[PDB]
Write a protein that binds this ligand. Structure first.
Ligand SMILES: CC(=O)N[C@@H](C)C(=O)NCC#CBr
Ligand SMILES: [Cl-]
Length: 130
């Protein structure tokens, strides 16, 4: 229905706003673009589903997220990819892991404060209906 299309459009507006707020944070610059294969040619071999915030924006606009849970799966991938690819004790790896965990925690904290639970439940019930 048009009511359902309005619902998903509101979801995309909300997700674009959350994603923009993460992308402008200087801590998260490394996560705004895909890893460059030049610098890191073993990346695309270790990490089977690369994810970054530009990929997330593209997915929002392709109507790939019908719930906030589906969006958070991709935010969690940004974090888990960084924990897997950069697991060492040296400062460069610890800094990337801390920034990745912080991205993920920031996204979850914005959604806790600003997502109405009944809105998410409506999205889930339309998605389940299709
Ligand atoms: C996202 C990720 O895991 N990237 C690894 C390869 C990394 O060491 N990044 C440093 C930088 C920059 Br900007
Ligand atoms: Cl830096």
């Amino acid at each position: 229905s048009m009511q359902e299309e309005d619902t998903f459009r509101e979801l995309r507006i909300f997700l674009r706003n959350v994603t923009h707020r993460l992308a402008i944070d200087k801590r998260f610059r490394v996560f705004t673009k895909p890893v460059d294969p030049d610098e890191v040619p073993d990346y695309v071999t270790v990490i089977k589903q690369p994810m970054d915030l530009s990929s997330v924006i593209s997915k929002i606009d392709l109507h790939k997220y019908l719930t906030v849970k589906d969006y958070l799966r991709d935010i969690d991938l940004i974090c888990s990819n960084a924990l897997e690819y950069n697991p060492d004790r040296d400062p460069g790896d610890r800094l990337i892991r801390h920034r990745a965990c912080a991205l993920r925690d920031t996204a979850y904290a914005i959604i806790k404060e600003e997502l109405d639970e009944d809105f998410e439940q409506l999205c889930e019930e339309i998605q389940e209906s299709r």
